[PDB]
Amino acid sequence: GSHMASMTGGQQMGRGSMSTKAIYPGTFDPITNGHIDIITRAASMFDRVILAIAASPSKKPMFDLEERVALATTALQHLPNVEVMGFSDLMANFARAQQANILIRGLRAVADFEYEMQLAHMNRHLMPELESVFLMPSKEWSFISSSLVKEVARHAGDVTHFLPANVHQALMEKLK
Amino acid sequence: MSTKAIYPGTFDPITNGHIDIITRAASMFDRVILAIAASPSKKPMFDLEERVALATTALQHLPNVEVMGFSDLMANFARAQQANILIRGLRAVADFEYEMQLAHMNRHLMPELESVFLMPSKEWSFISSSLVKEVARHAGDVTHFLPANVHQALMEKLK
Amino acid sequence: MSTKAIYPGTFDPITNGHIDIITRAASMFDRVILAIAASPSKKPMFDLEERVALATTALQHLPNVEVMGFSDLMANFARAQQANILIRGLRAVADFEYEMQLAHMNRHLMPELESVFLMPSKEWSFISSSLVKEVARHAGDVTHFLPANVHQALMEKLK
Amino acid sequence: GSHMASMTGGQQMGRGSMSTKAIYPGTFDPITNGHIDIITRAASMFDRVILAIAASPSKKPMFDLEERVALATTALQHLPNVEVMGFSDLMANFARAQQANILIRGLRAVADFEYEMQLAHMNRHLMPELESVFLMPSKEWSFISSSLVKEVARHAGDVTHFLPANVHQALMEKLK
Amino acid sequence: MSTKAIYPGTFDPITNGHIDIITRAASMFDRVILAIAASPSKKPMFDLEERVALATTALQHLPNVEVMGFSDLMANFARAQQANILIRGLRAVADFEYEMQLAHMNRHLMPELESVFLMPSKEWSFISSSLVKEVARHAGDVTHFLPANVHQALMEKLK
Amino acid sequence: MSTKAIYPGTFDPITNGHIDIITRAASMFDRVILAIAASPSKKPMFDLEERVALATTALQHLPNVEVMGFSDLMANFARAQQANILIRGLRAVADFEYEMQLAHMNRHLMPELESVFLMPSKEWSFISSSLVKEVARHAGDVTHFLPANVHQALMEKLK
Numbered sequence: 004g005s006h007m008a009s010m011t012g013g014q015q016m017g018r019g020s021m022s023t024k025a026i027y028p029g030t031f032d033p034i035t036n037g038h039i040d041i042i043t044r045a046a047s048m049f050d051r052v053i054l055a056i057a058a059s060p061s062k063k064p065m066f067d068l069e070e071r072v073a074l075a076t077t078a079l080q081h082l083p084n085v086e087v088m089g090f091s092d093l094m095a096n097f098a099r100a101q102q103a104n105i106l107i108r109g110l111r112a113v114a115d116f117e118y119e120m121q122l123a124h125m126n127r128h129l130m131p132e133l134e135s136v137f138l139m140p141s142k143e144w145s146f147i148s149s150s151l152v153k154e155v156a157r158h159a160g161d162v163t164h165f166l167p168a169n170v171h172q173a174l175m176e177k178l179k
Numbered sequence: 180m181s182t183k184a185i186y187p188g189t190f191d192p193i194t195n196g197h198i199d200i201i202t203r204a205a206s207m208f209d210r211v212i213l214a215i216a217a218s219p220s221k222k223p224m225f226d227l228e229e230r231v232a233l234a235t236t237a238l239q240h241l242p243n244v245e246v247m248g249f250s251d252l253m254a255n256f257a258r259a260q261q262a263n264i265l266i267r268g269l270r271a272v273a274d275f276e277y278e279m280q281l282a283h284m285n286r287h288l289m290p291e292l293e294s295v296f297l298m299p300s301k302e303w304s305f306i307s308s309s310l311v312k313e314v315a316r317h318a319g320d321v322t323h324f325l326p327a328n329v330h331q332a333l334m335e336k337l338k
Numbered sequence: 339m340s341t342k343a344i345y346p347g348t349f350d351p352i353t354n355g356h357i358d359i360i361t362r363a364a365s366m367f368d369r370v371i372l373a374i375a376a377s378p379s380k381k382p383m384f385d386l387e388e389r390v391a392l393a394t395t396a397l398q399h400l401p402n403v404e405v406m407g408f409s410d411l412m413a414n415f416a417r418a419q420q421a422n423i424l425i426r427g428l429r430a431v432a433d434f435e436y437e438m439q440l441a442h443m444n445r446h447l448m449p450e451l452e453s454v455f456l457m458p459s460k461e462w463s464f465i466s467s468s469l470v471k472e473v474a475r476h477a478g479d480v481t482h483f484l485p486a487n488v489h490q491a492l493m494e495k496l497k
Numbered sequence: 498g499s500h501m502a503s504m505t506g507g508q509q510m511g512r513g514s515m516s517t518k519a520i521y522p523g524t525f526d527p528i529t530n531g532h533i534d535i536i537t538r539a540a541s542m543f544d545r546v547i548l549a550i551a552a553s554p555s556k557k558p559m560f561d562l563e564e565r566v567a568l569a570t571t572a573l574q575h576l577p578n579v580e581v582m583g584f585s586d587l588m589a590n591f592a593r594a595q596q597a598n599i600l601i602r603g604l605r606a607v608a609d610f611e612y613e614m615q616l617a618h619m620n621r622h623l624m625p626e627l628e629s630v631f632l633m634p635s636k637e638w639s640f641i642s643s644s645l646v647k648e649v650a651r652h653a654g655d656v657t658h659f660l661p662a663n664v665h666q667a668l669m670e671k672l673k
Numbered sequence: 674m675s676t677k678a679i680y681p682g683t684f685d686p687i688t689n690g691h692i693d694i695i696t697r698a699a700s701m702f703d704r705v706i707l708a709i710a711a712s713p714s715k716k717p718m719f720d721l722e723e724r725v726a727l728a729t730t731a732l733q734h735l736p737n738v739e740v741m742g743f744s745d746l747m748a749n750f751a752r753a754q755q756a757n758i759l760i761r762g763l764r765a766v767a768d769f770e771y772e773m774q775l776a777h778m779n780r781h782l783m784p785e786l787e788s789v790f791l792m793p794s795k796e797w798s799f800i801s802s803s804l805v806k807e808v809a810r811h812a813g814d815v816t817h818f819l820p821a822n823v824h825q826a827l828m829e830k831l832k
Numbered sequence: 833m834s835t836k837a838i839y840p841g842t843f844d845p846i847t848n849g850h851i852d853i854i855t856r857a858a859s860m861f862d863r864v865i866l867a868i869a870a871s872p873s874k875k876p877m878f879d880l881e882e883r884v885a886l887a888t889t890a891l892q893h894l895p896n897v898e899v900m901g902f903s904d905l906m907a908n909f910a911r912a913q914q915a916n917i918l919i920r921g922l923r924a925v926a927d928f929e930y931e932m933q934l935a936h937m938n939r940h941l942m943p944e945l946e947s948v949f950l951m952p953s954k955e956w957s958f959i960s961s962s963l964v965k966e967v968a969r970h971a972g973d974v975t976h977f978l979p980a981n982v983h984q985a986l987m988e989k990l991k
Contacts, residue, residue, distance in 0.1 A: 016202055019243045020182070020209040044293055048182050048264055049207070093811050105207065110296060112929045113607040116275050117765045123298050124799040129813050134203055137269065137296035139282055142636060146936035158905035160941050252652035271435045272766055276608050283640035288654050305442040305795065317411035319447045341701055362787055366676050366702070366758060423701060428790060430611040431925055434769050441792050452697060455763065455790035457776050460954060464618035476587050478623055510855055513896045514835070514862040538946055542835055542917060543860070599860060604949060610925050617951050628856055631922065631949035636936050746970040770924050777958035782972050 015104070015132060023049040025105035025136070028094040030057045032064035033170045034075045035152055037144035041109045044138055046082045049105055054079060058091040065153055065177055078167040095129040103133065110137040111145065184208040184264035184295075185257050187249075189216050191223035192329050193234045194311055196303035200268040201244060203297060208264060210243050217250030224312060224336060237326045254288035265294045270304065343423035343454070344416055346373040346408070350382040351488045352393045353470055355427070355462035360403060362456055363425045369402050371419055376409040383471060383495060396485045413448035421451070428455040429463060509598070509626060517543040519599035519630070522588045524551045526558035527664045528569045529646055531603070531638035538632055539601050540576050547595060548573060552585035559647060559671055572661040589623035597627070604631040605639065676701075678758035678789070679751050681708040681743070685717040686823045687728045688805060690797035694762040695738060697791055704737050706754060711744035718806060718830060731820045748782035756786065763790045764798055837917035837948070838910050840867040840902070844876035845982045846887045847964060849956030853921040856950060858894050865913060866891060870903035877965060877989060889981045907941035918947045923957065 007013075015021055027042050031054065046052045054075055058068045066074065068089045076087045090097040098106060106126060108119055123135040147165045156162045157178055163171055186201050190213065197213075205211045213234055217227050225233065227248045235246040249256040257265065265285065267278050275296075282294040306324045315321045315333055322330055345360050349372065356372075364370045372393055376386045384392065386407050394405040408415040412424060424444065426437055441453040457463075465483050474480045474492055481489055501507075509515055521536050525548070540546045548569055552562045560568065562583045569581045584591040592600060600620060602613055617629040641659045650656045650668055657665055680695050684707065691707075698705045707728055711721045719727065721742050728740045743750040751759060759779065761772050776788040792798075800818050809815055809827060816824060839854055843866065850866075858864045866887055870880045878886070880901045887899040902909045910918065918938065920931050935947040951957075956977075964974045968986055975983055 016206050017241060019205070021206055023207050048293060048295070093808070095813075096811060110275070112933075113272055113276055114767070114926060114929045116269070116272050117767045120298055121765070121799050121801075121804075124301050125804060125808065127301070129808070134207065135298065136207070137298070139279055139294065139296070142283055142286070142639070145636070146933040151933070151937060155905065155937065155941070158908070160905050160907065164940075252649065252654050254654065255652070271439075273432070273435060273608055276606050280606075280640045280642075280645070284645060284649065287658075288649070301795070301799065305439050307439075310439065310443055314411070314443060314447065317414060319411060319413070365674055366787060366789070430615075431766055431769050431773075432608060432611050434763070434766050438763075438792050442795050445794070452701060453792060454701070455792070457773060457788060457790070460777060460780075460957075464615040464622075464954070469615075469619060473587060473619070473623070476590060478587050478590065482622070510859050511893060511895075513858070515859055517860050542946055542948070604928070607925055607929060610922075610928050614951050614957075618954050621954070628860060629951065630860070631951070633932050633935055633947065633949070635939070746967070746972050748972070749970070767926075770926060774924075774958050774960075774963065778963060778967065781976070782967070 021104070023051070023105050024101070024103045025049045025052045025107050026055045026094065026098050026101060026103045027052055027107040028055040028057065028090070028097070029109075030060045030064055030149070031071050031075055032060075032066050032149050033071060033166070033174060034078055035144070035147055035149055035165055035170075036167065037109070037111075037140050037147050037165075038075075039078055039167065040141050040144055041107065041138050042079065042085060043082060045107045045136075046085050050084065052082075052085045052107070053101060053103065054085060054087040055090045055094065055097060056087065058089045066173070070173065074170050074173055077169045093129065095126050095133060098133050099130055106133050106135045108135055108137050110139050111148075182208040182210075182264055183260065183262040184211045184266045185214045185253070185260065185262045186211055186266040187214040187216065187253060189219045189223060189308070190230050190234050191219070191225050191308050192230060192311075192325070192333065193237050194303070194306050194308055194324055194329075195326070196268065196270075196299050196306050196324075198237060198326065199300050199303055200266070200297050201238060202241060204266045205241050205244050208266075210245070211241075211266070212260060212262065213238065213244065213246045214249045214253075214256060215246065217248050225332075229332070233329050233332055236328045252288065254285060254292065257289060257292050263291065263293060265292055267294065267296055269296045269298055270307065340369070341367040341423055342369045342371070342419065342421045343367040343425050344371050344373045344412065344419065344421045345425035346375060346412055346415075347427075348375050348378040348382060348467065349389055349393055350378070350384050350467050350471075351389060351484070351492065352396055353462070353465055353467055353483050353488070354485065355458050355465050355483075357396060357485065358459045358462055359425065359427050359456050360397065361400065363454075364400050364403050367423055369404070370425070371421065372397065372403065372405045373408045373412075373415060374405065376407045384491070388491070392488050392491055395487045411447065413444050413451060416448055416451050424451055424453045426453055426455045427458055429458055515598070517599055518545045518547070518595070518597045519543045519601050520547045520549045520588065520592050520595060520597045521601040522549040522551065522584070522591070524554040524558055524643070525565050525569055526554070526560050526643050527565065527660070527668065528572055529638070529641055529643055529659050529664075530661065531605075531634050531641050531659075533572055533661065534635050534638055535601065535603050535632050536573065536579060537576060539630075540578050543599055544578065546576075546579050546601070547597065548579060548581040549584045549588065549591055550581065552583050560667070564667065568664050568667055571663045587623065589620045589627060592627050593624055600627055600629045602629055602631050604633050605642075674757070675703055676758055677704045677706075677754070677756045678702045678760050679706050679708045679747070679754065679756045680760040680762075681710065681747050681750075683710050683713040683717060683802070684724055684728055685713070685719050685802050686724065686819065686827060687731055688797070688800055688802055688818055688823070689820065690762070690764075690793050690800050692731055692820065693794050693797055694760070694791055695732060696735060698760045698789075699735050699738050702758060704739070705735075705760070706756065707732065707738065707740045708743045708747070708750060709740065711742045719826075723826070727823050727826055730822045746782065748779050748786065751786050752783055759786050759788045761788060761790050763792050764801070835861040835917055836863045836865075836913065836915045837861040837919045838865050838867045838906070838913065838915045839919040839921075840869065840906060842869045842872045842876060842961070843883050843887055844872070844878050844961050845883060845978070845986065846890050847956070847959055847961060847982070848977050848979070849923075849952050849959050850921070851890055851979065852953050852956055853919070853950050854891060854897060855894060857919045858897050861917060861919075862896065864894075864897045864919070865915065866897060866899040867902045867906075867909060868899065870901050878985070882985065886982050886985055890979045905941065907938060907945065910942060910945050916945060918945055920947065920949055921952060922949045923952055923960070
């Protein structure tokens with residue numbers, strides 16, 4: 004109510020709007036316009052957002068952690084409440100270490116929905132206070148992925164519409 | 180700053196699944212409206228009045244939620260209410276496909292409206308308003324899936 | 339002890355697809371009942387009596403199979419017939435979510451009831467009572483899909 | 498070969514390209530830009546295409562057969578190899594009556610895929626010489642349907658982008 | 674007829690999900706074999722001998738259930754064991770396409786082997802060895818997932 | 833007027849299902865190229881040379897089909913070959929989501945290329961290269977699913 008600190012610290016649920024801090028994990032190898040759109044839309048409705056970049060994915064990425072983090076930072080510089088960071092644990096454990104209460108997930112295809120539901124159940128088991136929030140990609144970006152853009156780019160297809168200029172130039176550099 | 184979210188549905192009637200969604204949503208957004216469809220395609224068991232009153236009581240305890248009836252284009256309602264976020268729960272794959280389509284259409288009608296999706300708790304993952312009805316309409320226990328005010332009103336409808 | 343299984347549906351009329359499902363169940367379970375819903379959601383083409391009759395003839399050659407009607411929750415008719423098993427035909431991924439819903443609810447209702455899911459034969463994987471009738475209603479050929487008693491009945495119905 | 502008619506009329510498989518005539522069945526209540534895209538693409542790759550309009554859909558249509566047929570005729574009259582007709586039969590029977598050998602189906606959502614496959618098995622059983630061919634909608638028209646356009650229009654939403662002018666007028670007139 | 678069933682998988686390790694599935698299979702068929710794949714595609718955390726041991730202990734309370742290894746076509750092992758039933762536990766929609774494939778192919782390889790699908794308990798429907806392991810490769814209580822012996826064994830394996 | 837279509841794939845090896853698709857496609861389009869991917873991400877069992885050779889013999893009977901290796905962007909290949917139609921077979925729901933994504937991308941890369949989709953025959957609806965290889969590898973009879981030339985070459989590979 005006012006000086007209620009002496010009586011209670013406060014619960015998360017049932018009591019109105021709490022501070023929100025979101026993580027948006029992925030490999031971002033490299034960040035595409037689809038990613039930027041998602042994080043832009045998240046940053047608009049949550050207090051803070053961390054773009055969390057997986058340091059050691061399963062498949063060796065085309066860009067190293069240091070390149071991924073630098074490229075996303077530049078592309079996201081225009082969002083004042085977004086911070087880019089690397090991580091190397093369960094998104095849940097990083098989330099806890101970061102005191103995040105929102106996990107952002109992009110929801111691109113029907114194929115993924117079953118996996119996303121399962122991951123979310125597991126994440127609720129791991130970190131009950133972590134709420135997963137799902138955003139569909141803009142129509143513009145619904146078919147693109149980092150994977151697809153790299154493979155089109157390797158064979159010289161035009162991918163300028165899908166990447167920020169800083170990433171597109173880095174990408175060309177990687178491909179000779 | 181300010182977030183104002185609409186959670187639309189038919190809520191005929193509101194279940195524990197809905198309450199879970201709206202509770203979670205109302206922890207993340209400054210205000211939430213449960214927007215109850217006036218004139219659903221399939222004529223419902225409870226009318227708007229009944230639905231709105233049951234929901235109002237079921238969510239009375241949440242400080243920052245309001246229950247209202249609407250009967251126009253969600254774009255115009257959200258705009259009327261100056262809401263920037265549309266909340267939908269996603270139970271099943273079938274429902275995602277259809278919600279994705281509506282999201283695209285709403286992006287066209289109202290570019291400044293953000294659609295956002297939540298998944299049910301595992302506890303409520305199988306319930307729906309339709310299922311609770313059909314079970315109770317053949318005397319199955321549904322007391323676990325509904326608030327008392329709603330259970331009673333349902334029992335009352337089936338007598 | 340024993341296993342007693344229920345294969346519910348409207349069977350309006352029964353097709354070689356159903357007859358396959360029940361033949362396979364009847365080979366792995368001591369008794370099986372073909373439970374023909376009396377009051378389906380839409381009005382049937384054949385009334386329960388015609389249906390129960392047609393199914394009875396069609397399945398005469400199966401020793402441990404009984405054809406009955408039922409108008410209530412499956413968990414009730416199961417209880418009533420002292421059945422421990424529920425047979426569900428499982429054709430498409432598009433059915434699987436809905437079937438998994440009903441399975442959770444029937445466990446909630448009747449936790450001693452087991453839902454068992456059989457895939458139809460590739461031969462019958464695209465047919466249904468509905469499609470068979472729609473096709474027949476415009477004089478398409480459906481002789482491959484129905485036993486003769488049913489095929490004769492249907493022809494007579496469409497005059 | 499030369500004049501092998503005395504010897505054979507020829508069979509459809511194993512012997513190069515044959516004349517193609519497609520039917521594109523639906524209720525088209527009313528025809529949208531999505532429909533127009535499908536059939537335009539069809540008409541560019543097959544010799545003739547018939548837009549087949551279901552006389553008696555299961556749900557009562559907003560436009561009657563006569564009105565549906567007229568609206569489509571107009572929307573499609575710039576395609577020289579397209580004809581619009583009503584029909585009240587199995588698509589397979591109409592195609593037989595019409596001596597069609599291709600059935601066009603639009604393929605918009607995951608949810609329909611298995612239904613479509615099942616319909617294609619039925620139609621193969623009914624008319625072996627009928628081939629089903631599946632086209633996806635343009636990104637541009639991926640979300641629209643007649644149903645959704647009608648319900649948006651009923652509530653005064655702007656649907657001018659999804660319909661040809663003749664249809665958009667007919668529609669406002671129904672909903673006055 | 675007499676009913677003997679095969680329940681194949683890697684079971685690396687077994688979980689309460691499997692145990693639930695095999696229990697339910699067990700309770701409708703005379704005998705059930707938990708058929709453990711010897712050489713799975715990726716190398717397992719537990720070797721065949723450990724896996725069989727963990728399983729045997731876990732299911733020891735089920736009289737009519739026997740664990741075994743197998744390193745061939747499922748259809749052949751089934752023919753060898755004179756099994757007339759194959760047990761698949763259907764969790765997700767995604768897997769159902771792939772399981773429908775295998776079932777058609779097994780019908781081709783072994784026409785006398787009937788495929789039977791059981792859906793998991795709501796409780797267990799998200800759990801999967803691979804998940805558990807990858808959780809346990811970091812942290813988080815899995816006591817409710819695994820049986821005691823498996824729990825302990827896994828704990829040991831960690832470091 | 834004239835139509836020229838590409839059917840791209842890995843065809844490692846070509847099966848009866850692929851032959852069915854291309855036969856059907858070559859009856860509706862003037863010319864068809866079977867385009868065989870030179871460098872698949874996964875290393876194939878048969879190299880490009882063997883894959884093209886087997887495919888060439890398998891489709892030798894079809895007057896208006898040519899089998900070619902490619903190792904570039906389909907858009908440039910189709911452009912190189914002056915092809916205006918891309919043919920993909922569509923077996924499963926999984927395949928459809930992915931195929932729809934590439935079709936959008938291809939429409940961005942090559943607006944004048946029309947993507948077209950065919951369902952397998954019921955006969956071949958469950959087969960794939962991967963599955964036939966896996967059955968063969970454990971001695972399963974797969975003679976019904978491949979041409980003689982291809983069968984012989986597979987048996988050779990697996991010795």
